[PDB]
């Protein structure tokens, strides 16, 4: 019923037509309701953020100076630093935590990282578009102090007054980082959740963001905490295995398409699946990660994200206690078989 | 093959015949090997105890002064204190921890406790034998300072030099208690395990003791820790539900029949099912519970009882964390479904 989805595409100012159309969105087996698109001055948006519910802010001017960013401009002022760059034979970019790749030997990586100079990525990209290849690239690099003076100028022009104040009103911890993300159309970052508050600032291109609340942990089936893909869903949204993951048939998402100038508040613990529209061109995004507020001095009923916190801790403790993360599953099963199930 | 069981019944001194015969033992679906019966001076027995494996000591003189105990003698020197007495319409005496009876409302007790004077129990017993009723009684009362002078004399005559030294050589903690157990023939105390070291001193009658090592946790299915029957098996040995408890088909026990003068070492965490032989007459036993040695400063591989310790703690912590022990199961299932199973 109320599964509108992203809603009717927005009309770009100056009768320039629809910014995008449904045919650029991929097809999924689950329904979704729309994420509210509001003005930062709108009281509702502040209520949504405080209550940790997603919202799309349209007029923050958060990264106004970056709206002009494009491959050329960047490959001219970003510097000569090294930029992490992932690759993939498919559109899906599953992330792997390398420090955990030891716990699992029978794990075969699908997207390899590769440091390089911006001009190399831009070239490798152009080269990829040359022979009309199928390979896909996704540059994801934290912004360090090694960036050109211009980029630094642009950075200073971000609306710090607005975000810092947001950080203040929510009691959040410190900004841990700003990841710069440049990706090819069709690219997909599979559903996953974070332990930090996220302000996702779109700059170039359009991105479809599908979010699931913490209480859908049961339908999303995250990998084991000690596994490299910790925090990611094991469910393949394109070919879901309902035998292994029955409750994915019950998953209900919240979606929206963000474009140049939109800022999406992705609350801590909320799953998010993000895809760059098909034939939409490269996309550029800069996000802002903040440690969440501290843990209260607790109150029941417990919130969904708190139970997720508990489960993660249990898995961690058992891994240390048993001296081997591989024993976690067999111990958990022994504990519940014929006792709690 | 080597499933001898208790072995051929022992021959009582003075050609008084077999102390008991197989027909007094109940029938079970699992095999068992015999628990070794040795002399306290036998080095092997000391090795078994140190390695925490069960053993039957035949000549400790642990409770020599009590070998003369019988209903009359006791109902003449035990005192006027109160003695806990359980009842049951069946031969099975499942135990219920009352402090936990609040966590589960949908729990209907099967054996009710009832304080009374020794002479009342002896009378109630005689009365029960009068009308040839079916009710069964099992007196289980800790020995306090309110016992007659004679019983106190007898108590002092126990071989403290032997047991105290055992306590010394094993690094055990302190003797927590001595439970006096008087029961009717056919009575059964269902399989369960303890967190303390146990010296089970038989005094009158014969008892069949079936033990299972800690590593059979998977086949015995203990109730949830917060449940009243914590530490007991949910499996009904007389009519085992293989659908709910599949690995009970894999259970392998160690058994033996103890009689007047035998002392059975039931190591901490070892499951024990204890039954008074059918038509064997009332039985009397006094046990000795000691806190185990302290926890080392750990080493892998981990021992079976250590994993049991871990699982109990996990269940306890989650019960507190969630603020309701009833949420433990649903949380554990959410954690493993489609992730660790």
């Amino acid at each position: 019923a109320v599964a509108s989805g992203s809603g009717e595409p927005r009309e770009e100012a100056g009768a320039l037509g629809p910014a995008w159309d449904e045919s650029q969105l991929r097809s999924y087996s689950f329904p979704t309701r729309p994420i509210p698109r509001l003005s930062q001055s709108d009281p509702r948006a502040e209520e949504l953020i405080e209550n940790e519910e997603p919202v799309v802010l349209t007029d923050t001017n958060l990264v106004y100076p970056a709206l002009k960013w494009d491959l050329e401009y960047l490959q001219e002022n970003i510097g000569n630093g090294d930029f992490s760059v992932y690759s993939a034979s498919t559109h899906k970019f599953l992330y792997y935590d390398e420090k955990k790749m030891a716990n699992f030997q029978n794990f075969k990586p699908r997207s390899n990282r590769e440091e390089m100079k911006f001009h190399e990525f831009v070239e490798k990209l152009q080269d990829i578009q040359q022979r009309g290849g199928e390979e896909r690239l996704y540059l994801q690099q934290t912004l360090n102090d090694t960036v050109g003076r211009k980029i630094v100028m642009d950075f200073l022009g971000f609306n710090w007054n607005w975000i810092n104040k947001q950080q203040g009103k929510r009691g959040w911890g410190q900004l841990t980082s700003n990841l710069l993300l440049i990706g090819m159309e069709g690219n997909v970052t599979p559903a996953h959740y974070a332990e930090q508050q996220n302000f996702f600032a779109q700059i170039k291109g359009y991105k479809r963001c599908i979010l699931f609340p913490p209480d859908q942990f049961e339908c999303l089936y995250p990998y084991p905490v000690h596994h490299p893909c910790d925090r990611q869903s094991q469910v393949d949204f394109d070919n879901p295995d309902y035998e292994r993951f029955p409750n994915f048939q019950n998953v209900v998402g919240y979606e929206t398409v963000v474009g140049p100038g939109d800022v999406l508040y992705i609350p801590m613990y909320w799953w998010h699946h993000i895809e760059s529209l098909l034939n939409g061109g490269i996309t550029i995004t800069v996000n802002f990660w903040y440690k969440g507020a501290p843990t209260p001095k607790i109150e029941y009923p417990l919130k969904a994200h708190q139970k997720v916190a508990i489960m993660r801790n249990i898995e961690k403790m058992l891994g240390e206690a048993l001296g081997n993360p591989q024993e976690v599953g067999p111990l958990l099963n022994t504990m519940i078989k014929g006792r709690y199930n | 093959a080597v499933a001898s069981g208790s072995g051929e019944p022992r021959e009582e001194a003075g050609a008084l015949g077999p102390a008991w015969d197989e027909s007094q033992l109940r029938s079970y679906s699992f095999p068992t090997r015999p628990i070794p019966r040795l002399s306290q001076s036998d080095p092997r027995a000391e090795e078994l105890i140190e390695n925490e494996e069960p053993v039957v000591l035949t000549d400790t003189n642990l409770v020599y002064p009590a070998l003369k105990w019988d209903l009359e003698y006791l109902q003449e020197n035990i005192g006027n204190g109160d003695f806990s007495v359980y009842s049951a319409s069946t031969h099975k005496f499942l135990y219920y921890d009352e402090k936990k009876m609040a966590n589960f409302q949908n729990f209907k007790p099967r054996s009710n406790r009832e304080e009374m004077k020794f002479h009342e129990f002896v009378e109630k017993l005689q009365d029960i034998q009068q009308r040839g009723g079916e009710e069964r009684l099992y007196l289980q009362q800790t020995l306090n300072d309110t016992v007659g002078r004679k019983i106190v004399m007898d108590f002092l005559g126990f071989n403290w030099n032997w047991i105290n030294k055992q306590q010394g050589k094993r690094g055990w903690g302190q003797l927590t208690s001595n439970l006096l157990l008087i029961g009717m023939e056919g009575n059964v105390t269902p399989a369960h395990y303890a967190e303390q070291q146990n010296f089970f001193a038989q005094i009158k009658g014969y008892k069949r003791c079936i033990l299972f090592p800690p590593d059979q946790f998977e086949c015995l299915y203990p109730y949830p820790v917060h449940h009243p029957c914590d530490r007991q098996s949910q499996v009904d040995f007389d009519n085992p539900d293989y659908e709910r408890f599949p690995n009970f088909q894999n259970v392998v026990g160690y058994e033996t029949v103890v009689g007047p003068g035998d002392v059975l070492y039931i190591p901490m965490y070892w499951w024990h099912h204890i039954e008074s032989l059918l038509n064997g007459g009332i039985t009397i036993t006094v046990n000795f519970w000691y806190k185990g040695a302290p926890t080392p400063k750990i080493e892998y591989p981990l021992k079976a009882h250590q994993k049991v310790a871990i699982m109990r703690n996990i269940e306890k912590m989650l019960g507190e964390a969630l603020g309701n022990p009833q949420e433990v199961g649903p949380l554990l299932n959410t954690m493993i479904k489609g992730r660790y199973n």
Binding site: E195, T295, A309, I310, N313 | -
Partner: peptide, 6 residues
């Protein structure tokens, strides 16, 4: 606690 992240 146990209800804490990281």
């Amino acid at each position: 606690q146990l209800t804490s992240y990281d």
